Amino acid sequence: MVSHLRGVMPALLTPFDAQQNIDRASLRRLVRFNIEQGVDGVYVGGSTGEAFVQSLSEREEVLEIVAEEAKGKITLIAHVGCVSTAESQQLAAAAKRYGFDAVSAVTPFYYPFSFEEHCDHYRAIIDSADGIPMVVYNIPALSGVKLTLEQINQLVTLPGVGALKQTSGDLYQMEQIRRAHPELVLYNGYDEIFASGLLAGADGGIGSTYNIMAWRYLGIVQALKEGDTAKAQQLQHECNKVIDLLVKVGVFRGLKTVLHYMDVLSVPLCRKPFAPVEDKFQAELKALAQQLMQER
Amino acid sequence: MVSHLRGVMPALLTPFDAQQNIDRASLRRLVRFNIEQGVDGVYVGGSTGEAFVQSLSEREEVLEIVAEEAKGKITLIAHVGCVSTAESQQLAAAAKRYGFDAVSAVTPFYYPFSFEEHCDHYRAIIDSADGIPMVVYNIPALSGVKLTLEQINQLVTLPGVGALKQTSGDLYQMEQIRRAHPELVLYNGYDEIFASGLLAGADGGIGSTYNIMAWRYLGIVQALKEGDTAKAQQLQHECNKVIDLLVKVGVFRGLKTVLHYMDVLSVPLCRKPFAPVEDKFQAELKALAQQLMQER
Amino acid sequence: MVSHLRGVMPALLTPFDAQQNIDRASLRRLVRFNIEQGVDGVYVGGSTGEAFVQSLSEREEVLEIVAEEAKGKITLIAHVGCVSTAESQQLAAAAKRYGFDAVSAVTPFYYPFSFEEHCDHYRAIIDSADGIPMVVYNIPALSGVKLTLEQINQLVTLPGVGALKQTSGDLYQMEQIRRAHPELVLYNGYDEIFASGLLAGADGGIGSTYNIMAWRYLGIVQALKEGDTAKAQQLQHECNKVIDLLVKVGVFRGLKTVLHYMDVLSVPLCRKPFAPVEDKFQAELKALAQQLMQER
Amino acid sequence: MVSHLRGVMPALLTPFDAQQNIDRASLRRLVRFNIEQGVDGVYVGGSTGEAFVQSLSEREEVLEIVAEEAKGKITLIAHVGCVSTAESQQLAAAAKRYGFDAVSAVTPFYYPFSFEEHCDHYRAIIDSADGIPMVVYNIPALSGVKLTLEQINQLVTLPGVGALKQTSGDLYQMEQIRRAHPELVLYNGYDEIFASGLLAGADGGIGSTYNIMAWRYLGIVQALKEGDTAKAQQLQHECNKVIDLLVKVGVFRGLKTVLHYMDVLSVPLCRKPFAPVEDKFQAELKALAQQLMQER
Ligand SMILES: [Cl-]
Ligand SMILES: [Cl-]
Ligand SMILES: [Cl-]
Ligand SMILES: [Cl-]
Ligand SMILES: [Cl-]
Ligand SMILES: [Cl-]
Ligand SMILES: [Cl-]
Ligand SMILES: [Cl-]
Ligand SMILES: [Cl-]
Ligand SMILES: [Cl-]
Ligand SMILES: [Cl-]
Ligand SMILES: [Cl-]
Ligand SMILES: [Cl-]
Ligand SMILES: [Cl-]
Ligand SMILES: [Cl-]
Ligand SMILES: [Cl-]
Ligand code: NA
Ligand code: NA
Ligand code: NA
Ligand code: NA
Ligand code: NA
Ligand code: NA
Ligand code: NA
Ligand code: NA
Ligand code: NA
Ligand code: NA
Ligand code: NA
Ligand code: NA
Ligand code: NA
Ligand code: NA
Ligand code: NA
Ligand code: NA
């Protein structure tokens, strides 16, 4: 019923300009760039999208622009999650108006909420999504919400939930989820274990580093499907060499900087309090961009 | 230079109406109620104020209303903190325009920031505060940011920082901070250890339960000053009986409900995804309100 | 029924010789030294006693020596806890034979045990203690066992349990325990919050730094009893200056080194893998010993 | 130089009798049973071996018995780790006398040790091992020691270290270790992610559930080598159905109970404070044993 949601989808970055306003022109180029990488969809306004340093009107603006460029070409998932249920509902209804294929919401964070409150939160957003499915988004490292398997089981069986974005390194739990829900769309969230996450039960992934090297992750899926165990390991080895660097420099700004050297983004800035990239990393980030372009 | 910031100050709740909009009339009554409890100041738009389910315009609206009722009567501290530095700066400049005595900012959260990024974040807000001092706000349990003593030492010595709101149960660290900064204004943040936090080095406190029983905390300060060890323990014992209940029912909504039964708030609702109080707790919450009113 | 267990009791260190065997002569001097500090008792074979790098026969040897020097002079508590229930029972029966006033056992650790298994573990040790009361020992930072209030409530109401050694910095929980068990003997375990822990509900303490400056902690009890709030804070301030140093140098070996400079221990070594004190700290540790001796 | 250490090796359980003494006859049958499963080696006296509820003489007794049955047939690794360095050295020298192929030591736990102290601890044990290589054993969930990649890098390059037993679910770190040490023998420690751990870089595994179904894990290695991605996932799916049950009943006692129903162990008891299996699980554990025997 929602198998059209399976696949490999970049967590879209939100380009900003030299004054940290939204860079609309570069955003549109970034969407077309990802489309031309062969991805199955894009995930807009997520953690990687710097959602939580943007206003609601800014996030809606980004959602509508992406729909203009991508609707009917690749799958469109709108991350609508806020701490506030009402704010999340507003973005869900906007995503519906704009033609998105699905919505998604991080577990509301900062304040402790009971599990029933989390459930009611998802139900309300599903209501406002007005018929497009919900992608539950579990990211314990950032949210501080550590859901049990049984809690995950209750969320992904809520009426309206069509998928789970599982940004967790616990691949025992990944397998348990697959075994309990053989048909669930299950995205691996940590790029650095993509190959192992697929083997454990994920049938796709949503990741930030897909914005600069989606073909590698698409290649890992293909290798595992074909039985080329060694090819999958070698691709993941190269992916993690890049992730090691991005972690050193700062992930979001490192990816924006690589995309700038690939002539995709005019300005590679993140919003404060993210600092700019340190000058001493620029040489290696440019070399990475050139390597990746030649790799294609 | 900033000793006028010392004392006992409620973490102001933000009243909402039956549709979860800001209840401006009840907010104004809540400010006057707290003033008439004898508090030294109020802390507006903090964690207890449900800041992170409100928009910037909503938070500014609350700041200005509180300044109208309280400026020149009690000390006014504006919690301006957001994840975004620019958003925090906007609220800092607003707080300055409205006549606040100080600003405050939680450590930016959800995303991991380096310590230098945290420092630069506070510097930027201090700049926008345009001459009123900054109250660094440390709440590891909710922020996920666990600052070391040495990091706290660097923040509270930033030019412009006049105080620390220490919402931590580590009273070794509390004492270390007092010993390193004998003149620092140092607020105990966990009401349930108020008496022990003062003994460890705090010279005041900012707390959510002060909204319904500030005289008890004022009484603890007095007992310790006078040497009545037993009186302080007995007051804290009674404070924690109340905190036990509020934790059972949900703290914010429990306090709003007690204030509703005290004829301060017309509507005791928190914003979703906070649920309403369960009916089975109403009897005990009303009895608590009556007890507290008679206690005065 | 067990009020004779209340008070201030050093966590006895276990002296070793230049080859890391038990130094029996220095152990006997350490017991008499602590007695002559005015302490209410001693706690033998605990965490501070390096119990978990000693064999059962070594621990029994230490228990019997201490009983020889201290029985009938000060209260004698034997820490008998091991991971193994049978091993703990052997030390409990030994402590009974040797004339101890009480036994104690850390929550068994390394392996995860259910709460019922923890309860049954204490019951078995209580049985082998053959009529002397049990001191439950909660030290989450080292054991990895974080007991809830309700679990603590069930343990301290087990038949045979006469006290709780609460080595936790959560002074909300400390107060909750006091309020639930107004007669329970409740030892503050973290010396660096002694004064705040007493105010929160502890009626005594068991601590490692008591071995070199028990009079300070005895002085804090007296100050709080007399209502001298400032004196308690000043004593704790000085205690924590010492704890800061001991943490820098290594706590156990730092205390053994101070005691060596006080002519109590012939050799200040801990067992491997504890390293020896670094030469650069020796000057300050000797100065501390001289300061403490002159302080008396 | 130490490639003879690669492979799939059960974490040997230590059989006990009805009075919880070592069951020597059943131990000898368990060794031969594992040999006849086709394993590459056995890991003796580890966490699964209930090492930390046994004395040194008991552990030496088990080491020597296993060497008698297995030396020259399969690879022999002796887990010699204690908190005490001297105790670990005693077991290392014993393992050398008995003809073991390697020693291993968990990171010393309960007390906090500096990283240099950990390094010196391994060096001392390596010295006492007198020429057989060391298998560093990292199990953060039980030890409370969370080693960084850089710390792991320094340990596995110590002279004498030939392998790493990586009982961690972080398969980013697993890959980082493989990439940094392309020749290191690297055991996956969590059976429930075996297939994903191999894909991430492990070249073998040491696991407790191997004692009852080693052929499955051997089958996963073969599937991945042959490129049968689906077969590996299906075997791991079945392995985790069993692990789910064992976690419900208690892992060690569940495995001992399955082995009892397989006529390998005469008595399936663990030492207190491990409780016995609850009667309500016996039916399912016997059915599992029969299933596994028929599976062969
Ligand atoms: Cl374009
Ligand atoms: Cl538009
Ligand atoms: Cl929850
Ligand atoms: Cl539900
Ligand atoms: Cl009014
Ligand atoms: Cl207004
Ligand atoms: Cl930080
Ligand atoms: Cl700085
Ligand atoms: Cl003497
Ligand atoms: Cl003797
Ligand atoms: Cl437990
Ligand atoms: Cl019980
Ligand atoms: Cl046999
Ligand atoms: Cl033998
Ligand atoms: Cl460490
Ligand atoms: Cl080293
Ligand atoms: Na940008
Ligand atoms: Na698609
Ligand atoms: Na989450
Ligand atoms: Na991913
Ligand atoms: Na309200
Ligand atoms: Na004031
Ligand atoms: Na914080
Ligand atoms: Na407070
Ligand atoms: Na010594
Ligand atoms: Na006594
Ligand atoms: Na404990
Ligand atoms: Na203490
Ligand atoms: Na057994
Ligand atoms: Na072998
Ligand atoms: Na470890
Ligand atoms: Na394994």
All residues of chain A having their beta carbon less than 8 Å from the beta carbon of residue D193 are: 171-172, 175, 196, 200
Starting from the edge strand earliest in sequence, which strands make up the sheet with A41-44, in order? A8-10, A204-207, A185-188, A161-166, A134-138, A102-106, A75-79, A41-44
In the block, tokens 């310590």 appear at B115
Contact C20 D86 (CB under 8 A): yes
Residue C94 lies in a domain: yes
C-alpha C191, offset from chain centre: 10
Task: Encode A103-115 in three state secondary structure.
Answer: EEEECCCCCCCCH
The token pair at B28 is 């104004």
Whole-number Å distance between alpha carbons of C213 and C217: 7
Q: Of D201, D225, D236, which is closest to A175 when you measure between CB atoms?
A: D236
All residues of chain B having their beta carbon less than 8 Å from the beta carbon of residue C179 are: 237, 240-241
List the catalytic residue out of C98, C165, C217, C256.
C165
Buried b / exposed e over A149-159, threshold 16 CB at 10 Å, is eebbebbbeee
* Helix or strand holding residue A136 (H, E): strand A134-138
Q: Of B172, B199, B236, which is closest to C233 when you measure between CB atoms?
A: B199
Check if the beta carbon of residue D79 is closer than 8 Å to that of residue D44.
yes
List the catalytic residue out of A43, A98, A122, A137.
A137
Contact A113 B86 (CB under 8 A): no
Whole-number Å distance between alpha carbons of C139 and C167: 5
Distance from CA of C155 to the nearest CA of B (A): 21
Contact C179 B233 (CB under 8 A): no
Contact B176 C240 (CB under 8 A): yes
In angstroms, what is the resolution?
Answer: 2.1
Work out whether strand A75-79 and strand C204-207 pair parallel, antiparallel, or are unpaired. Answer: unpaired
Q: Around Cβ D111, how many Cβ atoms within 10 Å?
A: 18
Interface test with D, best of C13, C58, C83, C252 (most D CBs within 10 A): C83
Q: Give the residue on C whose Cα is nearest the Cα of D55.
A: C55
Q: Is A167 annotated as a binding residue?
A: yes
Distance from CA of B184 to the nearest CA of C (A): 16
Residue D148 lies in a domain: yes
Residue A240 lies in a domain: no
Ligand 3 centroid–CA A147 distance in Å is 7
Contact D111 C274 (CB under 8 A): yes
All residues of chain C having their beta carbon less than 8 Å from the beta carbon of residue D275 are: 114, 116-117, 120
> Closest by alpha carbon to B104, among B117, B95, B113, B112?
B95
In the block, tokens 């159905």 appear at D241
Whole-number Å distance between alpha carbons of A275 and A253: 8
* Helix or strand holding residue B144 (H, E): none
Packing angle between helix A115-129 and helix A149-156, nearest 10 degrees?
Answer: 20
Residue B164 lies in a domain: yes
Ligand 24 centroid–CA B205 distance in Å is 5
Contact A111 B274 (CB under 8 A): yes
Q: Please, which residues have CB within 8 angstroms of residue D56's CB and are 6 or more apart in sequence?
A: C55, D82, D87, D90, D91
Chains A and D lie in contact, requiring 3 or more CB pairs less than 8 Å apart = yes
Number of domains in chain A: 1
Q: Around Cβ B53, how many Cβ atoms within 10 Å?
A: 24
Whole-number Å distance between alpha carbons of C262 and D8: 56
Ligand 11 centroid–CA C111 distance in Å is 11
Check if the beta carbon of residue C32 is closer than 8 Å to that of residue C262.
no
**Domain range for A188:** 3-226
The token pair at A55 is 């206003």
All residues of chain C having their beta carbon less than 8 Å from the beta carbon of residue D273 are: 83-85, 108, 113, 117-118, 120-121, 124
Alpha-helical (H) ranges within A184-270 are 194-200, 210-226, 229-249, 251-261
Whole-number Å distance between alpha carbons of A186 and D145: 32
Q: Give the residue on B whose Cα is nearest the Cα of A53.
A: B84
Q: Is D165 annotated as a binding residue?
A: yes
Residue C98 lies in a domain: yes
Whole-number Å distance between alpha carbons of D169 and D255: 21
Count of CB pairs separated by less than 8 Å, A with D: 84
In the block, tokens 């600069």 appear at A212
The token pair at A214 is 């989606």
Q: Of C170, C190, C227, which is closest to B229 when you measure between CB atoms?
A: C227
Return the CA Rg of chain A.
Answer: 18
Ligand 27 centroid–CA C179 distance in Å is 21
Buried b / exposed e over C122-160, threshold 16 CB at 10 Å, is bebbbebbeebbbbbbbbeebbbbebeeebbebbbeeee
Residue B237 lies in a domain: no
Whole-number Å distance between alpha carbons of C282 and C253: 11
- Tell me whether B194 touches chain C (CB under 8 Å): no
Distance from CA of D17 to the nearest CA of C (A): 14
- Tell me whether C271 touches chain D (CB under 8 Å): yes
Whole-number Å distance between alpha carbons of D36 and D30: 10
All residues of chain A having their beta carbon less than 8 Å from the beta carbon of residue B85 are: 271-273
Check if the beta carbon of residue B127 is closer than 8 Å to that of residue B89.
yes
* Cα separations in angstroms, D127 against B294, C204, D34, D158: 75, 46, 30, 12
> Closest by alpha carbon to A63, among A4, A2, A22, A33?
A22
Residue D21 lies in a domain: yes
C-alpha A149, offset from chain centre: 22
Check if the beta carbon of residue D16 is closer than 8 Å to that of residue D58.
no
Q: Is A48 annotated as a binding residue?
A: yes
Residues β-bridged to residue B163: B135, B185
Residues β-bridged to residue A207: A10
All residues of chain B having their beta carbon less than 8 Å from the beta carbon of residue A120 are: 272-273, 275
- The amino acid at B56: L
- Tell me whether C115 touches chain D (CB under 8 Å): no
- Tell me whether C85 touches chain D (CB under 8 Å): yes
Q: Of D199, D232, D233, which is closest to A233 when you measure between CB atoms?
A: D199
Contact B193 C196 (CB under 8 A): yes
- Tell me whether B278 touches chain A (CB under 8 Å): no
Contact A199 D195 (CB under 8 A): yes
- The amino acid at D167: T
Interface test with C, best of D16, D50, D53 (most C CBs within 10 A): D53
* Cα separations in angstroms, B58 against B12, B16, B61, B274, D50: 14, 11, 5, 18, 60
Whole-number Å distance between alpha carbons of D162 and D41: 15
> Closest by alpha carbon to B232, among B207, B190, B197, B185?
B197
Task: Encode C214-229 in three state secondary structure.
Answer: HHHHHHHHHHHHHCCH
Q: Give the residue on A whose Cα is nearest the Cα of D179.
A: A237
Q: Of D172, D192, D244, which is closest to A169 when you measure between CB atoms?
A: D172
Interface partners of B (3+ CB pairs, < 8 Å)?
A, C
Whole-number Å distance between alpha carbons of B60 and B43: 14
What beta strand segments (E) does B51-159 contain?
75-79, 102-106, 134-138
The token pair at C66 is 């201490």
Q: Please, which residues have CB within 8 angstroms of residue A286's CB and are 6 or more apart in sequence?
A: A261
> Closest by alpha carbon to A66, among A93, A90, A37, A101?
A101
Q: Nearest ligand, CA of residue A156?
A: 4
Packing angle between helix B149-156 and helix B171-180, nearest 10 degrees?
Answer: 40
* Cα separations in angstroms, D148 against C260, C273, D152: 36, 20, 6
- Tell me whether B119 touches chain A (CB under 8 Å): no
- Tell me whether D234 touches chain A (CB under 8 Å): no
Backbone angles phi, psi at C289, to 5 degrees: -60, -45
The token pair at A75 is 């799958």
Ligand 32 centroid–CA D103 distance in Å is 18
Whole-number Å distance between alpha carbons of D236 and D240: 6
CATH number at residue D203: 3.20.20.70
Query: Which string of DSSP letters, residue by residue, matches chain C?
Result: --GGG-SEEEB----B-TTSSB-HHHHHHHHHHHHTTT-SEEEESSTTTTGGGS-HHHHHHHHHHHHHHHTTTSEEEEE---SSHHHHHHHHHHHHHHT-SEEEEEPP-SS---HHHHHHHHHHHHHHHTTS-EEEEE-HHHH-----HHHHHHHHTSTTEEEEEE--S-HHHHHHHHHH-TT-EEEE--GGGHHHHHHHT--EEEESTHHHHHHHHHHHHHHHHHT-HHHHHHHHHHHHHHHHHHHHH-HHHHHHHHHHHTTS-S--PPPTTSPPPPGGGHHHHHHHHHHHHHH-
* Helix or strand holding residue A274 (H, E): none
Whole-number Å distance between alpha carbons of D287 and D152: 42
Indicate the Cα dihedral angle C11, C13, C14, C20, nearest 10°.
150
Q: Of B53, B109, B117, which is closest to A275 when you measure between CB atoms?
A: B117
Q: Is A14 annotated as a binding residue?
A: no
C-alpha B170, offset from chain centre: 18
Sign of CA dihedral D262, D265, D266, D269: negative
List the catalytic residue out of A98, A122, A165, A256.
A165
Q: Is A127 annotated as a binding residue?
A: no
